[PDB]
Amino acid sequence: KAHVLAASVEQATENFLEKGDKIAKESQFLKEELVVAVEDVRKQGDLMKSAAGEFADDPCSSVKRGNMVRAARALLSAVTRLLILADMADVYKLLVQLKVVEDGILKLRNAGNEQDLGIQYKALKPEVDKLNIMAAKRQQELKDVGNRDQMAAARGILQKNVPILYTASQACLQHPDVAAYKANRDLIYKQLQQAVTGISNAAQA
Protein backbone atom coordinates (compact mmCIF):
# COMPACT_ATOMS: atom_id res chain seq x y z
CA LYS A 1 0.00 0.00 0.00
CA ALA A 2 3.01 2.34 0.19
CA HIS A 3 2.31 3.02 -3.49
CA VAL A 4 -0.71 5.04 -2.34
CA LEU A 5 1.83 7.55 -1.00
CA ALA A 6 3.99 7.40 -4.08
CA ALA A 7 0.89 8.02 -6.23
CA SER A 8 0.17 11.19 -4.28
CA VAL A 9 3.68 12.52 -4.88
CA GLU A 10 3.16 11.77 -8.57
CA GLN A 11 -0.29 13.44 -8.62
CA ALA A 12 1.13 16.52 -6.90
CA THR A 13 4.14 16.66 -9.23
CA GLU A 14 1.93 16.52 -12.32
CA ASN A 15 -0.40 19.13 -10.84
CA PHE A 16 2.55 21.44 -10.11
CA LEU A 17 4.12 20.96 -13.53
CA GLU A 18 0.83 21.72 -15.24
CA LYS A 19 0.72 25.11 -13.53
CA GLY A 20 4.42 25.74 -14.12
CA ASP A 21 4.21 24.84 -17.82
CA LYS A 22 1.42 27.38 -18.24
CA ILE A 23 3.29 30.20 -16.48
CA ALA A 24 6.44 29.47 -18.53
CA LYS A 25 4.40 29.56 -21.75
CA GLU A 26 2.40 32.70 -20.94
CA SER A 27 5.09 34.82 -19.27
CA GLN A 28 6.22 38.04 -20.90
CA PHE A 29 9.14 38.16 -18.47
CA LEU A 30 11.86 35.60 -17.74
CA LYS A 31 10.23 33.32 -20.30
CA GLU A 32 13.33 31.34 -21.27
CA GLU A 33 14.48 31.15 -17.65
CA LEU A 34 11.08 29.92 -16.42
CA VAL A 35 11.19 27.25 -19.15
CA VAL A 36 14.60 26.01 -17.97
CA ALA A 37 13.43 25.98 -14.36
CA VAL A 38 10.30 23.99 -15.23
CA GLU A 39 12.32 21.58 -17.36
CA ASP A 40 14.36 20.78 -14.28
CA VAL A 41 11.32 20.31 -12.10
CA ARG A 42 10.17 17.81 -14.71
CA LYS A 43 13.59 16.13 -14.85
CA GLN A 44 13.91 15.86 -11.07
CA GLY A 45 10.23 14.96 -10.91
CA ASP A 46 10.70 11.88 -13.10
CA LEU A 47 13.77 10.82 -11.11
CA MET A 48 11.67 11.09 -7.98
CA LYS A 49 8.92 9.04 -9.63
CA SER A 50 11.38 6.18 -10.13
CA ALA A 51 13.01 6.45 -6.68
CA ALA A 52 9.67 6.75 -4.86
CA GLY A 53 8.31 3.75 -6.76
CA GLU A 54 11.32 1.63 -5.79
CA PHE A 55 11.06 2.72 -2.17
CA ALA A 56 7.32 1.96 -2.06
CA ASP A 57 8.01 -1.50 -3.51
CA ASP A 58 10.79 -2.22 -0.98
CA PRO A 59 10.16 0.07 2.10
CA CYS A 60 12.73 -1.54 4.39
CA SER A 61 15.64 -1.15 1.95
CA SER A 62 17.83 1.54 3.54
CA VAL A 63 19.34 2.01 0.09
CA LYS A 64 16.13 2.54 -1.89
CA ARG A 65 14.91 4.74 0.95
CA GLY A 66 18.11 6.75 0.65
CA ASN A 67 17.74 7.18 -3.10
CA MET A 68 14.18 8.42 -2.53
CA VAL A 69 15.18 10.92 0.15
CA ARG A 70 17.91 12.34 -2.09
CA ALA A 71 15.68 12.46 -5.15
CA ALA A 72 13.12 14.24 -2.95
CA ARG A 73 15.70 16.85 -1.98
CA ALA A 74 16.67 17.50 -5.62
CA LEU A 75 13.02 17.81 -6.61
CA LEU A 76 12.11 20.30 -3.89
CA SER A 77 15.24 22.32 -4.76
CA ALA A 78 14.07 22.63 -8.35
CA VAL A 79 10.57 23.60 -7.13
CA THR A 80 12.10 26.35 -5.02
CA ARG A 81 14.06 27.71 -7.98
CA LEU A 82 10.89 27.87 -10.08
CA LEU A 83 8.92 29.65 -7.34
CA ILE A 84 11.70 32.24 -7.06
CA LEU A 85 11.73 32.93 -10.80
CA ALA A 86 7.91 33.03 -10.93
CA ASP A 87 7.96 35.63 -8.14
CA MET A 88 10.62 37.72 -9.93
CA ALA A 89 8.50 37.58 -13.08
CA ASP A 90 5.56 39.06 -11.14
CA VAL A 91 7.82 41.83 -9.83
CA TYR A 92 9.16 42.61 -13.32
CA LYS A 93 5.61 42.95 -14.68
CA LEU A 94 4.70 45.36 -11.86
CA LEU A 95 7.88 47.42 -12.41
CA VAL A 96 7.13 47.71 -16.12
CA GLN A 97 3.61 48.99 -15.40
CA LEU A 98 4.98 51.36 -12.76
CA LYS A 99 7.24 52.83 -15.47
CA VAL A 100 4.24 53.23 -17.75
CA VAL A 101 2.52 55.25 -15.02
CA GLU A 102 5.69 57.23 -14.28
CA ASP A 103 6.00 58.20 -17.94
CA GLY A 104 2.28 59.05 -18.03
CA ILE A 105 2.57 61.34 -15.01
CA LEU A 106 5.36 63.30 -16.68
CA LYS A 107 3.24 63.64 -19.83
CA LEU A 108 0.22 64.82 -17.82
CA ARG A 109 2.45 67.31 -16.05
CA ASN A 110 3.84 68.79 -19.24
CA ALA A 111 0.87 68.81 -21.62
CA GLY A 112 1.13 72.00 -23.66
CA ASN A 113 -2.54 72.98 -23.88
CA GLU A 114 -5.86 71.96 -22.33
CA GLN A 115 -6.71 69.76 -25.29
CA ASP A 116 -3.63 67.58 -24.84
CA LEU A 117 -3.93 67.74 -21.05
CA GLY A 118 -7.35 66.10 -21.27
CA ILE A 119 -5.98 63.42 -23.60
CA GLN A 120 -2.88 62.75 -21.49
CA TYR A 121 -5.19 62.55 -18.46
CA LYS A 122 -7.40 59.98 -20.17
CA ALA A 123 -4.19 58.17 -21.19
CA LEU A 124 -2.87 58.04 -17.63
CA LYS A 125 -5.96 57.21 -15.57
CA PRO A 126 -6.35 53.61 -16.85
CA GLU A 127 -2.65 52.83 -16.33
CA VAL A 128 -2.86 54.09 -12.73
CA ASP A 129 -5.87 51.88 -12.08
CA LYS A 130 -4.09 48.80 -13.43
CA LEU A 131 -0.88 49.55 -11.55
CA ASN A 132 -2.84 49.84 -8.29
CA ILE A 133 -4.51 46.44 -8.67
CA MET A 134 -1.10 44.87 -9.36
CA ALA A 135 0.60 46.71 -6.49
CA ALA A 136 -2.21 45.69 -4.12
CA LYS A 137 -1.73 42.02 -5.04
CA ARG A 138 1.97 42.48 -4.37
CA GLN A 139 1.25 44.12 -1.04
CA GLN A 140 -0.71 41.09 0.21
CA GLU A 141 2.37 38.97 -0.50
CA LEU A 142 4.78 41.25 1.37
CA LYS A 143 5.82 39.76 4.72
CA ASP A 144 7.38 42.77 6.46
CA VAL A 145 4.63 44.94 7.95
CA GLY A 146 6.97 47.84 7.37
CA ASN A 147 7.27 47.36 3.62
CA ARG A 148 3.59 46.51 3.45
CA ASP A 149 2.69 49.88 4.98
CA GLN A 150 5.11 51.81 2.75
CA MET A 151 3.46 50.12 -0.22
CA ALA A 152 -0.04 50.90 1.03
CA ALA A 153 0.90 54.55 1.62
CA ALA A 154 2.54 54.96 -1.80
CA ARG A 155 -0.46 53.51 -3.65
CA GLY A 156 -2.73 55.91 -1.79
CA ILE A 157 -0.61 58.97 -2.60
CA LEU A 158 -0.52 57.93 -6.24
CA GLN A 159 -4.29 57.52 -6.53
CA LYS A 160 -5.07 60.66 -4.56
CA ASN A 161 -2.67 62.89 -6.44
CA VAL A 162 -3.19 62.02 -10.10
CA PRO A 163 -6.53 63.91 -10.18
CA ILE A 164 -4.88 66.77 -8.29
CA LEU A 165 -1.99 67.05 -10.77
CA TYR A 166 -4.56 67.34 -13.56
CA THR A 167 -6.21 70.22 -11.71
CA ALA A 168 -2.82 71.84 -11.02
CA SER A 169 -1.66 71.62 -14.63
CA GLN A 170 -5.01 72.90 -15.81
CA ALA A 171 -4.52 76.03 -13.69
CA CYS A 172 -1.06 76.58 -15.17
CA LEU A 173 -2.44 76.38 -18.70
CA GLN A 174 -5.35 78.70 -17.92
CA HIS A 175 -3.12 81.22 -16.13
CA PRO A 176 0.32 81.08 -17.90
CA ASP A 177 1.67 84.24 -16.21
CA VAL A 178 1.03 83.07 -12.65
CA ALA A 179 4.15 81.53 -11.11
CA ALA A 180 2.33 80.18 -8.04
CA TYR A 181 0.44 77.65 -10.17
CA LYS A 182 3.64 76.24 -11.64
CA ALA A 183 5.05 75.87 -8.12
CA ASN A 184 1.90 74.03 -7.06
CA ARG A 185 2.11 71.76 -10.13
CA ASP A 186 5.73 70.95 -9.21
CA LEU A 187 4.77 70.25 -5.59
CA ILE A 188 2.09 67.75 -6.64
CA TYR A 189 4.46 66.22 -9.21
CA LYS A 190 7.01 65.73 -6.42
CA GLN A 191 4.46 63.96 -4.19
CA LEU A 192 3.69 61.64 -7.10
CA GLN A 193 7.35 60.85 -7.85
CA GLN A 194 7.88 59.97 -4.19
CA ALA A 195 4.94 57.57 -4.47
CA VAL A 196 6.46 56.06 -7.61
CA THR A 197 9.81 55.42 -5.92
CA GLY A 198 7.97 54.17 -2.86
CA ILE A 199 6.15 51.57 -4.92
CA SER A 200 9.36 50.64 -6.75
CA ASN A 201 11.33 50.00 -3.58
CA ALA A 202 8.51 48.34 -1.61
CA ALA A 203 7.82 46.00 -4.53
CA GLN A 204 11.37 44.66 -4.30
CA ALA A 205 11.40 44.21 -0.52
Binding site: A2, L5, A6, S8, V9, Q11, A12, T13, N15, F16, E18, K19, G20, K22, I23, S27, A52, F55, A56, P59, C60, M68, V69, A72, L75, L76, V79, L82, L83, A86, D87, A89, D90, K137, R138, E141
Partner: protein
Protein backbone atom coordinates in the same frame (compact mmCIF):
# COMPACT_ATOMS: atom_id res chain seq x y z
CA UNK B 1 -5.75 37.60 -12.74
CA UNK B 2 -3.71 35.74 -10.10
CA UNK B 3 0.03 36.37 -9.90
CA UNK B 4 2.48 33.57 -10.75
CA UNK B 5 3.09 33.18 -7.01
CA UNK B 6 -0.63 32.59 -6.34
CA UNK B 7 -0.93 30.14 -9.24
CA UNK B 8 1.94 28.03 -7.85
CA UNK B 9 1.27 28.48 -4.11
CA UNK B 10 -1.20 25.69 -3.29
CA UNK B 11 0.24 23.28 -5.88
CA UNK B 12 3.71 23.69 -4.38
CA UNK B 13 2.25 23.15 -0.92
CA UNK B 14 0.47 19.94 -1.94
CA UNK B 15 3.71 18.61 -3.42
CA UNK B 16 5.69 19.47 -0.29
CA UNK B 17 3.12 17.74 1.94
CA UNK B 18 3.03 14.62 -0.24
CA UNK B 19 6.83 14.38 -0.17
CA UNK B 20 6.82 14.74 3.63
CA UNK B 21 4.18 12.02 3.96
CA UNK B 22 6.17 9.57 1.84
CA UNK B 23 9.26 10.24 3.94
CA UNK B 24 7.16 9.78 7.15
CA UNK B 25 6.19 6.29 5.93
CA UNK B 26 7.26 3.48 8.25
CA UNK B 27 5.49 0.15 8.75
CA UNK B 28 7.28 -2.54 10.70
CA UNK B 29 4.80 -5.11 9.40
CA UNK B 30 6.56 -4.67 6.06
CA UNK B 31 9.69 -6.28 7.53
CA UNK B 32 8.05 -9.72 7.47
Amino acid sequence: HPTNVQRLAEPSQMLKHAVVNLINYQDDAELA
